[PDB]
Amino acid sequence: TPDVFISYRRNSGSQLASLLKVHLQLHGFSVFIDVEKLEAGKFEDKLIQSVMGARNFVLVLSPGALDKCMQDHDCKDWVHKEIVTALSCGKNIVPIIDGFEWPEPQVLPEDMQAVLTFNGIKWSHEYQEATIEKIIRFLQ
Amino acid sequence: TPDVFISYRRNSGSQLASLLKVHLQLHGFSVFIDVEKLEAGKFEDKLIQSVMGARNFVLVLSPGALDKCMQDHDCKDWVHKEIVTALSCGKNIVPIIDGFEWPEPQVLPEDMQAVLTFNGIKWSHEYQEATIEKIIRFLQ
Numbered sequence: 267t268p269d270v271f272i273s274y275r276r277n278s279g280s281q282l283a284s285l286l287k288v289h290l291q292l293h294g295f296s297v298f299i300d301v302e303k304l305e306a307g308k309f310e311d312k313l314i315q316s317v318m319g320a321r322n323f324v325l326v327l328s329p330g331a332l333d334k335c336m337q338d339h340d341c342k343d344w345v346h347k348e349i350v351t352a353l354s355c356g357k358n359i360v361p362i363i364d365g366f367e368w369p370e371p372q373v374l375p376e377d378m379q380a381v382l383t384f385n386g387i388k389w390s391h392e393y394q395e396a397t398i399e400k401i402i403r404f405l406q
Numbered sequence: 407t408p409d410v411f412i413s414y415r416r417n418s419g420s421q422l423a424s425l426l427k428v429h430l431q432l433h434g435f436s437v438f439i440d441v442e443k444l445e446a447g448k449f450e451d452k453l454i455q456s457v458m459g460a461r462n463f464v465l466v467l468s469p470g471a472l473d474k475c476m477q478d479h480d481c482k483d484w485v486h487k488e489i490v491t492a493l494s495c496g497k498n499i500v501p502i503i504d505g506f507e508w509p510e511p512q513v514l515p516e517d518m519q520a521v522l523t524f525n526g527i528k529w530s531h532e533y534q535e536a537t538i539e540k541i542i543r544f545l546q
C-alpha cells in the first residue's frame with residue numbers, strides 16, 4: 267500500500283505532480299500517481315481505495331486547480347472526489363501551492379471546503395530542494 | 407563544465423525543465439539549469455559560456471516557447487540567444503516536445519530557424535520513464 271497519494275489537475279499540474287513523485291520516491295516513500303499506479307478495473311473503486319490506502323494526501327494546487335470542483339455538487343469531478351475521500355478518512359492532507367490563488371470557501375461545494383484549512387507548502391522554483399525537504403517533514 | 411544545458415521558458419517549462427534535470431542527474435549527467443547553476447557575475451557572459459561549454463543542448467519546447475523569439479531581431483530574448491549560441495557552436499541540440507506547435511520557419515528570426523530541423527522527442531505523461539530513456543539515448 268502506497269504511503270502518498272498525489273492528486274492533481276492534468277492540464278496544469280502534470281509536470282509538478284511527476285516531479286513530486288520522483289523526489290518522494292528518492293526519499294523512500296511509495297507514491298501513487300494515476301499514470302503509473304492506477305491499473306486494471308473499474309477506476310471509480312480503484313481511485314477511491316487508493317486514496318483510502320495512503321496515509322498522506324498530497325494535493326497539487328496549480329493555478330485554477332479547483333475550478334472544475336466549483337458547483338460540482340453531484341461530485342462528478344475527480345479532484346473533488348479525491349479531496350472528499352481524503353477529508354472523510356482524516357488523511358494527512360498536504361497542499362502544494364504553485365500559483366494557486368486562495369478562493370472564498372463559498373465557491374466550493376460544502377463537502378470539500380475544509381481542504382483550505384490545511385497548511386500548504388509554497389512551491390519555489392529557485393529553492394526546489396528546500397521545498398522538497400519541507401514536504402518530507404510534513405509527511406507521516 | 408556541465409554535459410547538458412537546459413534551455414526553457416520560465417512561464418511554461420519550469421516544471422518540465424526541472425523534472426528533466428533530476429532524471430538526467432540520476433543517470434550520471436552534469437546538468438546546467440539557471441536556477442541551480444547560474445551563479446555570480448554578469449549573467450549575459452555566464453549564460454553564453456555555459457551553452458558554449460556543454461556538449462548537449464536540451465531545449466524545452468512547451469506551448470508558445472518560441473513566441474518571444476518571433477521578431478526579436480535585436481536578439482534580446484534569452485531563449486533566442488541560447489539557441490543561436492547552440493547552433494553557432496554545433497552543439498547536439500535535443501528538443502523536448504510538450505504541447506509545442508510547429509511554426510512555419512519564416513515567423514522565427516533567420517539565425518535560429520535551423521533549430522526546427524533537429525529531431526525532437528515527444529514528452530509522454532503516461533510513459534515518462536520511456537521518454538527519459540529516449541532522451542538519454544539522444545545525449546552524448
Ligand SMILES: C[C@@H](c1cc[n+]([C@@H]2O[C@H](COP(=O)(O)OP(=O)(O)OC[C@H]3O[C@@H](n4cnc5c(N)ncnc54)[C@H](O)[C@@H]3O)[C@@H](O)[C@H]2O)cc1)N(C)C(=O)NCC(F)(F)F
Pocket residue numbers: 272273274275276277299300301302304305309313334344345348532
Ligand atoms: C477517467 C481518468 C481519470 C480522471 C481523473 N483521475 C484523478 O483525478 C486527477 C486528474 O483529474 P483531471 O485533470 O480532471 O482528469 P480528467 O480531465 O477528468 O480526465 C483525464 C482523461 O482521462 C481520459 N479518460 C476518460 N475515461 C477514461 C478511461 N476509462 N480510461 C482511461 N482514460 C480515460 C479522458 O480522455 C480524459 O481527458 C488526478 O488526481 C487523478 O488521480 C484519474 C483518472 N482515467 C481513468 C485515466 O486517466 N486513466 C489512465 C491512467 F493512466 F490514469 F490510469
Ligand SMILES: C[C@@H](c1cc[n+]([C@@H]2O[C@H](COP(=O)(O)OP(=O)(O)OC[C@H]3O[C@@H](n4cnc5c(N)ncnc54)[C@H](O)[C@@H]3O)[C@@H](O)[C@H]2O)cc1)N(C)C(=O)NCC(F)(F)F
Pocket residue numbers: 392412413414415416417439440441442444445449453474484485488
Ligand atoms: C535575467 C534572468 C534570466 C533570464 C533568462 N535566462 C535563460 O533564458 C531561459 C529563460 O528565459 P525567460 O523565461 O524568457 O526568462 P525572462 O522572462 O527573460 O527573465 C526571468 C526573470 O528574471 C528576472 N531578472 C531580470 N534581471 C535579473 C537579474 N539581474 N537577476 C536575477 N533575476 C533577474 C525578471 O524577474 C525576470 O522576470 C532560460 O533557458 C534561462 O537559462 C536566465 C536568466 N536572470 C539573470 C535570472 O533569472 N537569475 C536568477 C537565476 F536563479 F536564474 F540565476
